[PDB]
Amino acid sequence: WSCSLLVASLAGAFGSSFLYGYNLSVVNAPTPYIKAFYNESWERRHGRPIDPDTLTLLWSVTVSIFAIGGLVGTLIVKMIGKVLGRKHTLLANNGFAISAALLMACSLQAGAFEMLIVGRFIMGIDGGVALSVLPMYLSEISPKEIRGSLGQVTAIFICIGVFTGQLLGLPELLGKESTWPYLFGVIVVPAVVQLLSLPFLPDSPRYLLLEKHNEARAVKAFQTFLGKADVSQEVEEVLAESRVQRSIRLVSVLELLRAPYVRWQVVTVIVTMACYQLCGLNAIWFYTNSIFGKAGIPPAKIPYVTLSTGGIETLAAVFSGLVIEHLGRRPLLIGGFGLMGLFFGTLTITLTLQDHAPWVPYLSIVGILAIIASFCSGPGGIPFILTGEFFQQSQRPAAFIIAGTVNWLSNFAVGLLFPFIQKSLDTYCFLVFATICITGAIYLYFVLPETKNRTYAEISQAFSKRNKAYP
Ligand SMILES: *[C@@H]1O[C@H](CO)[C@@H](O[C@@H]2O[C@H](CO)[C@@H](O)[C@H](O)[C@H]2NC(C)=O)[C@H](O)[C@H]1NC(C)=O
Numbered sequence: 001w002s003c004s005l006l007v008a009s010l011a012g013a014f015g016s017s018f019l020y021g022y023n024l025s026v027v028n029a030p031t032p033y034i035k036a037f038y039n040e041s042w043e044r045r046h047g048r049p050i051d052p053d054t055l056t057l058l059w060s061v062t063v064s065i066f067a068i069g070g071l072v073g074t075l076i077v078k079m080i081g082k083v084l085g086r087k088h089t090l091l092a093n094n095g096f097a098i099s100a101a102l103l104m105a106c107s108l109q110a111g112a113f114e115m116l117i118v119g120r121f122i123m124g125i126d127g128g129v130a131l132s133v134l135p136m137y138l139s140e141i142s143p144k145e146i147r148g149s150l151g152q153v154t155a156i157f158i159c160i161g162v163f164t165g166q167l168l169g170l171p172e173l174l175g176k177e178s179t180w181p182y183l184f185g186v187i188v189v190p191a192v193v194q195l196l197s198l199p200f201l202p203d204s205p206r207y208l209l210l211e212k213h214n215e216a217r218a219v220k221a222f223q224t225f226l227g228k229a230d231v232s233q234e235v236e237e238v239l240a241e242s243r244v245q246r247s248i249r250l251v252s253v254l255e256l257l258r259a260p261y262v263r264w265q266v267v268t269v270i271v272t273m274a275c276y277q278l279c280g281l282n283a284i285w286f287y288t289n290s291i292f293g294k295a296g297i298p299p300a301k302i303p304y305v306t307l308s309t310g311g312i313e314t315l316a317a318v319f320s321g322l323v324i325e326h327l328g329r330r331p332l333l334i335g336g337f338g339l340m341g342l343f344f345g346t347l348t349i350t351l352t353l354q355d356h357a358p359w360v361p362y363l364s365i366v367g368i369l370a371i372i373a374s375f376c377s378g379p380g381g382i383p384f385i386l387t388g389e390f391f392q393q394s395q396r397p398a399a400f401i402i403a404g405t406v407n408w409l410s411n412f413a414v415g416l417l418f419p420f421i422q423k424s425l426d427t428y429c430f431l432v433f434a435t436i437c438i439t440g441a442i443y444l445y446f447v448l449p450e451t452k453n454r455t456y457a458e459i460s461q462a463f464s465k466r467n468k469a470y471p
């Protein structure tokens with residue numbers, strides 16, 4: 001480690017990954033105060049009281065519109081990444097983080113509810129842009145000794161995000177009736193702590209050697225991050241990789257989706273990425289107070305019981321490293337989506353017998369904590385790794401658009417629908433996530449070949465038996 005690599009890692013993550021993790025839990029705690037402002041703001045403009053379904057819809061849209069922001073933001077990186085660079089994107093990106101926080105936090109004074117829905121969208125653009133650039137920036141600057149470890153550092157800062165959003169929402173802090181706009185207005189601090197930190201650090205070495213054509217700056221960037229005298233070895237390596245890679249014909253998204261010699265590597269990334277969101281963990285983050293409310297937990301205690309979830313999330317993510325490498329890929333993706341099946345099952349029991357005894361509701365807490373801990377000691381970080389290990393650099397840039405598009409449309413499709421599933425089934429609503437998790441686990445059992453300590457040549461050979469075609 002070196003000083004510049006610490007601040008590049010931390011002030012990178014703290015303004016770019018943490019504000020994804022925060023933005024998918026900050027919306028939980030002020031739920032009963034925001035829905036109330038919609039009610040009034042729909043009377044003083046449209047001249048009649050808001051009906052319960054329209055109110056449930058405006059909230060379902062306010063929560064989930066973030067994911068359409070994430071989709072739009074992901075497809076903006078494809079175009080911007082050729083022009084600005086790695087460092088300057090994570091600066092210019094905080095145009096969105098600040099311009100979205102100043103929309104949302106003024107929504108109560110201005111009286112119009114559009115500013116909060118549009119604010120969530122532009123805040124989604126940040127979450128789509130900065131999750132796509134931060135992994136590439138970190139893995140371009142780092143010594144070739146830890147490029148594997150920092151995949152846990154982008155993830156732990158999501159969890160410390162979802163936890164901080166659950167802490168400030170306690171009624172001791174900003175989650176009161178009067179202060180709720182500052183839950184959104186505080187997003188300016190992580191953004192400005194990044195803008196007053198990253199500019200002084202070097203831009204990524206690679207970008208300064210393969211796209212901006214400056215060896216002297218590339219050497220300075222390598223010397224500053226690696227903290228050693230000679231870097232000609234990495235300079236030559238990166239140019240050597242480029243001398244190979246520059247010959248490659250890239251595959252287009254529409255062409256990758258159809259060719260037979262990769263068909264099960266595309267189906268197995270769409271089916272992993274769908275279940276990674278439709279397993280419903282984001283419905284547990286956005287709507288936790290509703291879930292614990294209907295479980296029969298005492299109304300006065302739900303803010304404090306909720307805070308445990310972001311805790312057990314963060315402890316799970318911190319200990320994620322020492323299972324992902326030790327167990328390989330196959331018994332984790334059949335493990336996680338298998339145990340989330342058992343725990344959505346037993347949750348549905350404890351929600352339904354919630355009044356057959358006085359102690360049962362507190363087993364619905366343990367049920368949901370085991371759903372969280374089965375995800376992070378498990379699938380939490382793996383699908384974006386597997387998307388890389390199935391494909392060559394010829395295909396991989398297009399594969400990340402398929403695997404990125406399925407992700408955001410699934411985050412949207414569970415964040416928007418959950419209030420309507422819950423209203424229609426009551427205590428049995430979690431049998432939907434039980435059915436999708438176990439369908440994911442039965443699928444990956446019959447398809448996914450092991451990936452740890454296996455070459456691209458071996459993996460592709462295993463899929464050839466069902467692709468029934470070759471390059
Ligand atoms: C929207 O707000 C109004 C109040 O501004 C709510 O109406 C009150 O609801 C309570 C509980 O049912 C009644 O005791 C009051 O008499 C109602 N007041 C009026 C003026 O009707 C209304 O329920 C809210 N709507 C929703 C769906 O939240």
Ligand SMILES: O=c1[nH]c(=O)c2[nH]c(=O)[nH]c2[nH]1
Nearest residue numbers: 155158159162317376380381
């Ligand atoms: O560790 C994670 N926790 C989440 O809550 C989450 N959500 C997401 O999209 N990726 C991750 N990763």
